Design a protein around this nucleic acid. Structure first.
Lengths: 116, 168, 146
RNA sequence: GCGGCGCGCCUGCUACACCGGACCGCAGGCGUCCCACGGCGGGCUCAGCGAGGACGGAGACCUCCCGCGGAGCAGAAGGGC
């Protein structure tokens, strides 16, 4: 249940910079030698300011084409569309779930149903 | 404003139940899990009748149960409330003041997960008794207990709340 | 020679033939991240019968495995470098390997993901070779609920 | 009349409240089975009404509670426990 040395609430309130030092290579270099794009960066402040301003049950759950943006600890607690190549997949991010791409939790494939 | 001291509530006993069809040796494997926790030999209950959905065939051992009481009862049940985050569903209390909960993982109770011992889920049920209930079980003078002295579920939820500080 | 066959530790029998080194990577395999980077040396003899090894040498060996960092083994040899738990670098021993595997697989199920579906459905994960390569045994995408 | 066997035997009827009462009259069985399905002593309460409890639902287990027998006693049925 505890994630990367932080309890669920601590990591939830921890900044993106805080969880970044102890993380996987792709995650560390995502911002370490790189950063984020301006489109990717804007999307963060299109749910962030909504996740922190709940007036009741969320009326947003916005549908976003952007998919492989590594999820941020703060964005935990909300459902993101994580568009697969056709239809949006509603995804609620678990606090231990953070530290990996929103791509991993979204299914664009058929599970099985063949073998004929 | 004082209840008689016999009107207190005591955990008479705790039952421990598994239902591993019969498989090839699974019931024996659960015997190991029960033996360490209760320090007692679990007795193998038996299947009644033969059914299609499960593999019981009127003679396959289908379940293992041990009844634990006193100091052991408190600790084994306290384990069960911590692992159930001090939360229990409200309807679990029954008509005779008996309540139960479910325990995923024989390992979650602090037993080490083993390749040799596969995870076996068990379930619990704790029987609450008001001192003076012997009138129902003694070989001589066996007569039913009176209405007041029987634990009503509302009174027992209060004893569970007082005993473990649980919430529903 | 007091070869002393068996000398089992960690609930895993060893041999009077195995050299002191293969004896740990051969402790069920599970329980020893090997390549013998530190195993080759440790404090134990390089090439002798593994039963002959004295208990005191075995006990010091048990201690080096118990605290790898104290021995001076670099973190890269150890398996769990960052930990998704309390985030503390740790070695894996025999029982914890399959407990941690449950931790890795059951976490996968609770945090539903393509990497979990590619394990609950038993499809090989990552390779995407469930197309024309592994007729082998029938561990391939089949299906037939109705 | 050999199509049936009431040609030996048993249960419940028919049977007309002691008993005895007919019929190719009805509703059925018997020709076996079991050294435990026997004898005895001890313990025990059963089918189930509920109300609860990982998976677990018509349904499998484990709990209490109320449980006059509503259970099972090798097979016909009727007593009996």
């Amino acid at each position: 249940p505890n994630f990367r040395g932080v309890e669920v609430e601590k990591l939830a309130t921890m900044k993106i910079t805080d969880i970044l030092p102890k993380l996987n290579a792709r995650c560390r270099r995502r911002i370490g030698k790189h950063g984020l794009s301006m489109k990717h960066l804007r999307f963060v402040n299109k749910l962030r300011l909504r996740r922190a301003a709940q007036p009741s049950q969320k009326p947003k759950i916005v549908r976003t084409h952007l998919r492989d943006m590594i999820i941020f600890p703060e964005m935990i607690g909300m459902t993101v569309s994580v568009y697969n190549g056709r239809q949006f997949i509603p995804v609620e991010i678990k606090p231990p779930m953070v530290g990996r791409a929103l791509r991993e939790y979204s299914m664009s494939y058929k599970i099985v149903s063949h073998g004929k | 404003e004082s209840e008689n001291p016999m009107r207190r509530i005591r955990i008479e006993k705790l039952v421990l139940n598994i239902c591993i069809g019969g498989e090839g040796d699974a019931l024996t494997k659960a015997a190991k899990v029960l033996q360490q926790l209760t320090d007692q030999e679990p007795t193998f209950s038996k299947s009644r009748l033969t059914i299609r959905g499960f593999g019981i065939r009127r003679g396959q051992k289908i379940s293992t149960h041990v009844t634990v009481r006193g100091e052991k009862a408190r600790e084994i049940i306290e384990r069960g409330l911590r692992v159930k985050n001090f939360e229990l569903p409200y309807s679990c209390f029954s008509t005779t003041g008996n309540f139960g909960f479910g325990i995923t993982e024989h390992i979650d109770l602090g037993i080490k997960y083993d390749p040799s011992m596969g995870i076996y889920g068990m379930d619990f049920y704790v029987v609450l008794s008001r001192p003076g209930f012997r009138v129902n079980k003694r070989r001589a003078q066996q007569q039913h207990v009176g209405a007041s002295h029987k634990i009503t579920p509302d009174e027992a939820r209060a004893w569970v709340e007082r005993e473990f500080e649980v919430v529903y | 020679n007091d070869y002393r066959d068996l000398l089992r530790m960690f609930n895993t029998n060893i041999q009077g033939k195995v050299v002191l080194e293969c004896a740990l990577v051969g402790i069920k395999g599970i329980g020893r991240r090997f390549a013998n980077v530190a195993l080759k040396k440790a404090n134990i003899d390089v090439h002798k019968r593994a039963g002959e090894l004295t208990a005191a040498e075995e006990d010091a060996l048990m201690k080096v495995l118990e605290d790898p960092l104290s021995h001076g083994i670099p973190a890269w040899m150890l398996n769990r470098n960052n930990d998704f738990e309390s985030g503390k670098d740790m070695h894996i021993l025999v029982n914890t390997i399959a407990s941690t595997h449950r931790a890795d697989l059951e976490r996968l199920r609770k945090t539903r993901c393509e990497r979990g579906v590619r394990h609950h459905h038993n499809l090989k994960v990552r390779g995407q070779h469930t197309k024309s390569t592994g007729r082998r045994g029938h561990v391939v995408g089949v299906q037939r609920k109705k």
